[PDB]
């Protein structure tokens, strides 16, 4: 086991500088503070000599505010000087109440420190491919090159020859400043159509279904998970992936601790400890923790067949409607009352690829969705009794005939699962039918992934469906690719093929560049463009580390991330905070919004020099000198309620921030919105929610059924608690990499014995899409025939075995993946030290 | 004084321990609870003739709840937020919320069977220095 | 400026474990000790509590043994546990007398430490190109792939299809164990002809001239530098490149501190403080320090025209011979008297490419070399007076008629300089003529680079001249390349062209591998071989870090270096020492000798499986389990006096070791040889040394005269004091990279003004061979038109502008390079913190 | 304490410094020689109205010879083994044998012009703790 051998830590002194910090990482947006103080000072164990006013010569008790782990301490540059830093979770933040996950608690230790040698992989200088290798250079040189090639390609072939891949998310590697900066560059200065998002290969919404119905996906508050009678958790492994939401809000409900709260806010109705329905093919640690906290009788784990959620929800909707377990007044008052006729190709297809499902009235939707319990039990593999029980935990009135309060929460098991549009809609149908939107203890919400921080110009020009960018690239189209804060080599679908082609096309441009004179920049530009005209690709990567896709790029531009800059984002409750900068960017690294502005400025210069003065003038409006300038040009001018929000006002509100949208500013507080749709007026032109007539149609995405039928195992995929995303930071964190040097593939021990595998064996997963590697981890809770591989991982990429298959709106169907498995090596010595024991807590 | 000065403290005698049953202990002072545990197989940090005696903090490095030991499993388990630690692999967090593997004692068995502790390999929950 | 902010260091306690350590790095082989102790223990300031017996609560005085700098402290794994380590220079070692250079003194800080996060770039696992990226794997998998491909290729195309590049040197990355392991594999088990050495592109000697004359190049001892009347230092920048030899032995001669000892060991002649002739086109810090110590009157800096050494030496030899300042008895007794005939193509060409110069008697060599003072002044640019003065300082008898004692020392300014074979012989003529070999105060020696630790089977099959391997590779020949401990991307000649072609050929194999199924290992091997047959190359890298050339390789195998293994080598005086292992190899890394043995075993297994049992059997004799087994099989059985030497015996001798060859073992002491040739019997069949008739013939290597004529600046090249080699460790050492983020190019400040360059400007150096970059460093001591670029450096590789020109024996003529210079960028912001002040100490 | 406790020691008054002439001081005790130096141009670690006052150890971090100051170059120069340090650039070793750039004082000027030292950024030659 990895052990730091750090025996003591510097003590935060009483006069340390305090900074408000939201967690860099997941959607929960846990509150923290960063305390910094000079390198040659320290605090003392006496109360007056430390930030806590506690005597630190004594053992603190459980849940103390007056302790931090070594992963919470570092030394960092701040205004050119080394300072101590502690980044510690905030006890007074209502999101986390002082909980810090395994990820957030390592913010300090995954910061850049020269003094303590952490994250020495961080990028410090612009890099250009020249003289046969990547070489460091100045900003002026690298941006000049990027702009010259970009401007020439776009002037000769149009903006369609510019391909963009960029984050659209919040938190570190995103945020309002940074989504605005990039958005303004590509959607205001230009009209880039061939743009994709960091997690999906087209410029689309993950949840077109709920949005078209009039229900924005983040409509409740985290208190609603405390107040619900029943939590319905679909395709979420919340303990691992929305950890402190689960621990600080769901668990109190399951344990009965929120009963006093429920009784106070909701006096005219009965209350019991929360029950929870978990819809996931796999038994997770989240299932286990629910059982241990609530008791097995209060947890309904519906272990459906992969990809059959839509059948379950349509049966539940059918049963609840037929029992009349619905909110008749909500339906009459708030939902669309005149249904409309099915499109001609229904039920197999919608009116076009833009509209895979049919929006209508409650009654029409019930008849369109109609599916018996027995049919749903066949498709899902669930027992009829389990489905009936679930309908009861959702719809059946409480004693006195009071409405059951149900929070419906869903994440990537649904969004990246079968038939995204219809399955999203079918779940929303349930919440609408039961009046569980805009009221306490309700919601039909994304549980989320990253924090959210999106503000951009109109994307009307991208179309719907939008372009399938990876398929353009694989097919030899496009000329220049700008990549901002995503690494398709680890995380795209059909990743093996993507990599083969990307390498070849970028190699053309590299071979041309190594043979041309650099000091003659016009010759270099011309040689690059000739290679592009032959089918090559010129690629520019904006990131904070050397990425996998970066190994194919020609220019690398170093970014500064959250904490090295000021940054705004909102959590899964819409709670907007300001993370206040507490350290300096490594080397010459620069916030993404400012990269974008500098690139715009360079585009203006070069286009002017080329004589296209009208095109050049489109790149104005980027005189920003600090990230607050982008905040003010973006969020402050364009968000609803934006006038009310400034960095100074956000700062005054601390880690609790306010819930968007802002409705006013009075007495130093931004006034927010605790829940959406409280008046029952929905996000449609007439104010009514629509239901969705959304019949089951099997595995919707191309090739999926054939993939299932022709391979041995389900290769389910997703997150581990210990790993953040593609391990971009974690790869230089021994605590993480000592635990999993390879990605795990959870396998049932009988399956392993049948395939001749032993624990720790390195195995190849393969199918029609490609091949990859993983380490067999024996998992007694896995069902026979069903495996789970950690996604996004640099030492074995799961996406290599995902097909190119998407829905009509170009949503990637990563979860429905099947393949074969065969041994590559006996368990290597570098996994001899690992525990292969169960991840489930035992009381 | 560059490093922490750990006291060498007698915790028990080899004789006192039974296979797979923790014995409560405290190191490096009375306020830092932990256990000796004889595991029946040679393991990392394990002392005695069989190299199977380990000592660990039993206070969770996440938020400080006390860890229970499952004999069936030979794991430590946290009722706070469901962490699991493997004392047969150096206290590796099998799954959990701590950013630390379980602090493990550096043990020495004296010529008479007495078991001394003279260091710990990680920062014990609730102290900013392991020797207070 | 970089500052570690380490305010105190753990104290080595009295009971720490002591290990003998030779410096990893240069030829001088300074002695150190590694003291290790448990991570949870420490010393104290009382004498009883520390390894020094001193009260460390008191300030120490200059030159104290009881101190170490932060770069000498780390925490490392030893036998699986974290231990403190201090690696500090040995006061008692006669080589260094407690001096530690800027490189040696950072051995600890550049060791691998998970606890203190140093050198996290170190390789821990075998890596194989598969699934679109490099992936970690087991030794069994990686070795099997390497062997199957290698065996298939060799079986189908012969051993000539296998190309090898390997270290031949001592110290870290070499040594007797490692050179034996690799040599037994390629020269015993196989007869690989297409092999090159880490610093030159064929399997030749650097100094065939002196060797053919009978004068092995390491013939003296370091005391001789203290004892000479005159040191002649040719093409060496000893203060920076042989630092502690210079400081601990040359300096005391120049200062007159050695006078007492001179008088003592050689009474019967007069003695003055040593004088020094430095033959170097550039004024270096070495020249400066010499003036500062001896007075400018005792330093003669012959700032010759680049490449004109041979003309200077022939004029010296002619002048000294004509005056009769020669040791006539030595000439008569110990040198060739045979008459001979010049070969037919003399003087332009020798008898063949194998023999560029003509070996002869004293008298025939004088007539053949004959050059007037006036002709040599014209060629070299020196004044006639300077050449006459040098002749006097070398040959003029002292006050009794007593022979003047002269140490001739030479390094890469000669060896990588013009007409290596003739120039080497011409300098050796001077030492032969003056009887300054095998006597106190004499020698004609390499000053050296790496330590030495060569023992291998016969290389007779390679030929002479041997194959020019880079030209084979660049010309599309060969199939598989094994690369051991060298990085041609940074350090070969004509490196731009090399990188271009190397990338293309290896990419062909990458593209095949990415598209074939790895889990069917036979299909993978076939896809590889097919790609090889089409002109590709399969490349395997054995190294300790991810290298530049490693970015083109298909398999990477992780080595353990000195200190993580036991290792033997000798220094520039033939002082052989054992470095005693004090830490563990990182991860699954393995000593090179054991990698070679495991690869031999795999080759045996694989060839047996293919049915070539006779060939398989050639790979026996590699049952080694530890590096000492390779020492016993190689050095102990094959070196002269090897039977006297074992690990246990070397260990007892300490950092003083003994001088090779060993002549016996008595009283626990390996007995050795202080100087070679003390009896006048030389390394030829008749025991007579030969002179060389070596006439001046201009710039010998092809293209060099044209390169010079058609470009504006000399691009001289070489070392910096602070930087070790290609910065393989240093690139993750902030002290080094904070000083020089780009390689410097030293430029005369008027040349800078005339080219519009300022300090710190990023400039492109370019010519017919290629282009590269460097940072302009104003250097008032540079001559106009003469620049000097740091070689080998990853952020701007000087080799890119070296032509493919070699002499007849394939010695690369790196020093004679000319090119143009133009600005790439104004000084980048990442060099704003740099001092650009003179590197010369001021009194 | 986890870190070294530096004393805040008064070294001189700004009025005592003449441009480009070192003033001998000692910090953090009387056996650790150093200088204050006013450079006439704002520089790294420089204090005072013009940001041009610096303090350095004048004992060579290689083998402890005392450094001389060249006023024409503004460098420290070591007669031991030819090392050169640049006080206009944070004590950067321009060329030399130390593995450390020159230990520099963390300085503070008080309202009366008194210059205080409260830290040092490298390990001073000949002590294993900067505060003995
Ligand atoms: N520790 C950690 N937490 C994270 C992240 C991280 O990298 N690490 N990343 C964040 C991001 S960006 C995101 S998007 C979120 C993702 O959060 P989640 O969606 O909670 O996490 P996943 O592991 O992708 O998948 C959740 C579950 O979907 C299940 N599943 C698979 N197929 C199906 C199906 O057909 N139907 C149903 N109903 N379930 C199915 C899987 O078995 C799995 O347990 O997590 C965020 N949180
Ligand atoms: N700091 C440090 N020391 C090292 C090394 C290191 O990387 N760093 N590497 C080691 C190795 S492997 C080696 S081989 C040695 C090399 O040691 P040296 O040979 O001393 O070092 P170089 O800097 O290559 O070249 C020395 C001198 O040759 C001069 N020179 C250039 N052209 C000519 C010429 O035509 N004639 C003459 N006479 N001189 C010329 C240069 O101006 C330069 O000052 O150093 C070793 N020591
Ligand atoms: S206190 Fe142990 S898991 Fe949180």
Residue numbers in the entry:
A (entry chain E), C (entry chain A): 2 to 844
B (entry chain F), D (entry chain B): 44 to 175
What does the publication say?
In these structures, the Mo atom is cis coordinated to two oxygen atoms (O1 and Ox), shared with As/Sb. The Mo-O single bond distances are ∼2 Å (varying 1.77–2.29 Å in the four molecules of the asymmetric unit). In both structures, the As/Sb atoms are sitting vertically to the Mo dithiolene plane, at ∼3.1 Å for the As–Aio complex and ∼3.3 Å for the Sb–Aio complex and equidistant to the two pterins: the four dithiolene sulfur atoms are at 4.5 to 4.8 Å from As and 4.6 to 5.2 Å from Sb. The bond lengths within the As/Sb oxyanions (As/Sb to O1, Ox, O2, O3, and O4) are very similar in the four molecules. The crystal structure of a polyoxometalate containing μ-oxo–bridged Sb and Mo (CSD YORPUS) shows a similar geometry and bond distances as the intermediate structure (NT-26 Aio-Sb_d) now reported. Interestingly, a structure with two symmetrical μ-oxo bridges (H) such as observed in the X-ray structures (D) (NT-26 Aio-Sb_d and Af Aio-As_d) is readily obtained from intermediate C′ with a barrier of 11 kcal/mol. The Aio enzymatic mechanism relies on the formation of two symmetrical μ-oxo bridges, present in the oxidation of As(III) as well as of Sb(III).
Arsenite oxidase (Aio) is an ancient bioenergetic enzyme present in microbes since the early stages of life on Earth, with its origin dated prior to the evolutionary split of Archaea and Bacteria. Aio belongs to the dimethyl sulfoxide reductase family of molybdopterin (Moco)-dependent enzymes, with the Mo atom coordinated by two molybdopterin guanine dinucleotides (MGD). The large subunit, AioA, contains the catalytic Moco and one [3Fe-4S] cluster, while the smaller subunit, AioB, harbors a Rieske [2Fe-2S] cluster. The enzyme catalyzes the 2-electron oxidation of AsIII as well as of SbIII, albeit with pronounced differences in reaction kinetics: SbIII salts are oxidized around 6500 times slower than the corresponding AsIII salt.
